[model samples]
Target: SHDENFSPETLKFLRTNTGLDGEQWDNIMKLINKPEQDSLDWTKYYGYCEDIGDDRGYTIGIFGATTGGSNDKHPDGPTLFKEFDAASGAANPSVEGGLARIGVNGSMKGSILKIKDSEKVFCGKIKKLQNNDTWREAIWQTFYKVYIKYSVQQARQRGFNSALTIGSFVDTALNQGATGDSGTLQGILSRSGKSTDEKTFMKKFYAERTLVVDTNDYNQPPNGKNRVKQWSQLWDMGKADLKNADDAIVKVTSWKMK
Candidate 1:
């Protein structure tokens, strides 16, 4: 049924359109099968080391990832930090900090709890300011009202899979790490701050403090050594096409963030 959506001419044009050629087409298909790297569902909440050694400086993004699933791979959504050039297909970037590698595999456990506590404190303050006996109830009602509306919009545009709220994903990631079942390196939950409960704080602290990408030794395909040679001819073809065609680039339709 999906195939029927395109006529033979369209398929032919897509497949043999002198612009892409055989190898380029194959690479594009390989890249596509790999999933969109910029999808919102994949990005979610990420940790970044703001300064060289300031653990508390970490900030959560709009959405976050829960712990669980396969290791060393992007969770079920978009792949982060993978680079794309209109001509060279997709590759990894060489930046010190980007999406591809932010925090350690299991470092968000305590951070989520801290976030919850912080939110609770914020709510209490709001209630105190209002000075109403029913303030708690009203606050919750208003919170959910806005939360639900935003959830609906996110789900509609980015898909339900992409509708994860900020704290939910953070909690999930932390819990998974605590179980020792996640693919991330060990001891991520051992270095939290002093003001918080030690055990609980350690979990979040380590996760926040120790997570990092050792960009020195990034991964590569088994055939990576020869990829340049294998795709050299094809790359040249793409370069020529790009130069001649004013608007021949393929448009990406998934997970475009402003």
Candidate 2:
């Protein structure tokens, strides 16, 4: 049997790896665990929707990975099901199954009602993932990997290395995704004029992000502005905290760890 306890060491790695202080790490967790920050755990970010009824895609676990033409007019099946299968270890989620429901992999076309109708047929394996101890634990591991992957990717291309900035970038990346366009992380960095000053760069970055986040409806996410606002507020606090080190433990973010 596989074990399920999520380790603090992993959390600590997430905390320190971004080069942010413990307080900022804690802040990131609080924001990421929103609408349930008080009860942060595996379930905080987990999800599964057989049908969104929007006909865009069938939503899946963590980062709300979707299967159908939601983002870029292509099914996110390869991205989600494969990750699910790999993380579950015991479950073998199938791309073929997803394709059967979503259709032809990135044809930019599929039936939402068809996917809803074929939920059991296409995502049957996914239903079996619930309440799974190993699945839960593996989710945290997966999130850690995704977070670092984007954080570093952003840090490298953007050329700024504050942990708070990295945390904010990843938060935006989590909901909006880690890509470039006038409305994305990379695009925002690109537009921000490549400032060498970390604090000043993030300040301008926030403004650029706010403009995109407000105008684009955020890749068509459900009430995506809330997610944008959540981190935007955090960035505001981070600026204040940067100006004064006394803001620690009392301001910026309210979550803490031992």
Candidate 3:
């Protein structure tokens, strides 16, 4: 039967391309074919849903091991079953826990009615099915497609506006050196120190630039309240100081020969 469903050539393709072998192939065949044991097709027999009772407006199915036939080996049969509540719109059967509960709340009303209808319909359909595995797989596939489509659509709706800014005029000055390429009067500021790691060097350079901007006067004394006040004033001026410092660094660094 395995050979009939999967030809020798197909099996070879699976083995070579998909990398499945031996037990893996056997298990897949068993699952697909729904094999029988002891004169009973376990897959068909176990996946049957039989009516057990009714709760409120919903019908409940029980998982049995018998099919009510001359063959006792078939047992009553076990199928996935659920109980539905007509009044509350809840669908659950006596599945392992207790009476199947449905509906939006304990009392059940309004939207609860829809719940009852859906659950009852679902259980009824499952009852009609000889096997529930296929139905379950179909439902999962449908939901997965919906989720993936929605996620991609949402991402596209949001434009790429949050990009990070890294390279600036000051960075150019330090990397190329004063007077080397795009050197400028401000390039002299970058020559004060050097570090092999550009990132660390940039951070240090920016920190010194911040200090100079805060003090306002470039020649301001490094200590005392007067310098501190001037630095505060520079900080208050914001992006203006940043632009000026960057320009100055570019000017000086551009002057360097090497």
Candidate 4:
């Protein structure tokens, strides 16, 4: 059950930082995991690892953190590893320490993380970490630092803190980014037309996001519109709080992931 999945500590951390209770956060994860993991069970993806042939090196963990490669000049995977090392009680956290803690043979080459073992061997080790408490804590810590904190801050700044608003920002931040050049959350927010009315402003925000969700740095397919619709349609139906949203979650994510 989503309510029981997160540890009490993690639930406290989430509430303290994002102001979202377990059910609300779980609702957001279900929506995000639909497109990323092709399932609503986001907890099953903690140790998920793969190379998606995107020139971004290996995509790992829940948000597809990438090892720095040609496609992504500044990847977030290294930070995740360092956090893992910290969670493992490294006196001085490092990526190599994290890899060693997981018993995976890997080294950082400049910014690119190189796997020293065979892909199958390395990924198998990572798969076994799915249920590790330290790894899970590290995953949430890194996710909050990199994505959730920024997304929530952006929403609160605009006098909006509904689960739908924060989830929309989080989804966009993970797929795009919280800041930086055009198409990032900051860029979209700039064009969303500042309105005191939260609903009106969010409608514009969603419209602006839909326009470039596919053409930005990610260069994905037009199905990105459907991704935006998942939230916008929820908003239209007044599901902003996202409490008891199981049926709506199913309805919105019915579209093909693409």
Candidate 5:
């Protein structure tokens, strides 16, 4: 049940609180990593950073935390740096401390994180941290805070804790958001209808997400449908447990990585 996708500390935290074993989390992450990294090797993205013209500033790390730009009101990148600072043994961790440790100059502008260093310089420093244990720990901690906690809780509350269910919720939350007035995970879940049956509920959940996964703030319409299709088709084929799913991962990830 152990895996390379998460550090030992993160794995323990997930198993203890999320009630998902290591292999289950691995299966779930591989599904997510395909779209996120275009490879099953999620571990390689710890220091990954880019702008991708998303208007959210530089996207950073495994879960694509962003430095603030026009599109993002509250970027997750600052929190990631603060966590890195804490992991680096700062008595009172700050985003500034994290930036300093990473050898980059950055500041929070209102809710936005602004980098003073040239994007290339800043990103290079971040990229060099790809193998840093502290940075990896920080990213996972921030990822759990921003996405996993809400997503896993949502599934557990509905008496659904399968890997596919958790993965679907997590992917939706990461792509759309955990909360918003509409077109977010919470909003879509509310509209997914009340079915005590897990399969029935998830079918509606997939449909709800498909409707908006494309048109949400991050507008990758083609990828959105494929994202939903990965989970929905798995559910349709009664493969919700997500055990021994390498072939299915191949099948779903076969879509163009637009």
Candidate 6:
């Protein structure tokens, strides 16, 4: 069970953009703890990620923050750590001191395979937060400034609309990167090239994303299957854009994380 924070127009926009469904819906809701609702266990889920299928690492994040190669093996870890450094420094010296003691830095990058004992490393700072409000605020602010902002810009560049689509692209960009290597947003789009038809363009885009995910195949299951499936649903329903407002349904649900 859970709740939604986005407006009706926003929800419609998201659905139109990303074609979010059950699992995708569950994934996002779990991340932010259902919008305006309170999260007693904020730190436990913040930056939460996993390596599902795809030997390399395929993932999704809160508001779509991703790091390639492995679960929780993302750029935001170090990026946020750096921000935490500045935000918590004089502002929250003790928290900053904790980060220093943890020896967290932005120098690290890779997948679950690429990095060393990634599971513990990604959440190290979260472990040290001690659940203090000041520490949380400092870290959260920096996250918005960087992670969320970066995701938005990348989503817009691809000519996508709707909050759901923006969020989905952001997540993918985080997982695959917006630039660099073949496993990035730009890289994928470059391969797909430009198409006058939105459906055709996204079809190529989804294909590009699935192919990349196929490279990894973790112990779990082959990845990219579900993500592309969700997107395909949007297309199948003929709700790819706001042109058909009737097809765009506003999603509403309420519940709590246990």
- Tell me the whole-model lDDT of each prediction, alpha carbons only: 0.25, 0.51, 0.28, 0.85, 0.84, 0.45
- Candidate 3 per-residue lDDT, tens place, 43-62, comes to 34322333333222332221
What is candidate 2's lDDT per residue for 29-49, written digit by digit as tens? Answer: 555555223233424344345
Model 4 whole-model lDDT (C-alpha atoms): 0.85
Q: Residue 209 in candidate 4 has what lDDT? A: 93
Tens-place lDDT digits, model 6, residues 78-193: 44444545554555543234346456432333322233436566455445553444444444454446544555565566566444455445445545555667777667767876
User: Which lDDT tens digits does candidate 4 get at residues 1-258?
Assistant: 775667676788889999899999899998888767668888878888888888888888888888878887788888889999998889999999998887878888888888888879978888998888788778888889889999999899879989999999999888888898778888888899979887888899999999998785453575688788888999877789999899999999888756
Winner on lDDT (1 vs 4): 4
Ranking by lDDT: 4, 5, 2, 6, 3, 1
Better of 1 and 6 by TM-score: 6
Which prediction has the highest TM-score against the true structure?
4
* Count of backbone clashes, every candidate in sequence: 12, 0, 42, 0, 0, 20
The residue-level lDDT of candidate 5 at 70 comes to 90
Against the true structure, what is every candidate's RMSD?
23.4, 7.6, 29.6, 1.6, 2.0, 9.3
Give the runs in model 5 whose Cα sits over 4 Å from its true position: 217-219, 236-238
Against the true structure, candidate 6 reaches a TM-score of 0.51
Candidate 3: TM-score? 0.17
Model 5, 1-258: lDDT tens digits are 337567787777788877777777777777788767778777677778888887899999878899989987889999999999998999999998998897887788889988888878988999998877788789878988999999999999989988888889988888778898688789999999999898899989989888887784444868878878888888766678887777877787788878
lDDT of 5 at 66: 92
Q: Which stretches of candidate 6 lie over 4 Å from their true place?
A: 1-44, 47-76, 89-125, 128-151, 217-221, 235-258
Can you list the residue pairs that collide in candidate 5? none
Q: Who is ahead in lDDT, 2 or 4?
A: 4
Candidate 2 TM-score to native: 0.60
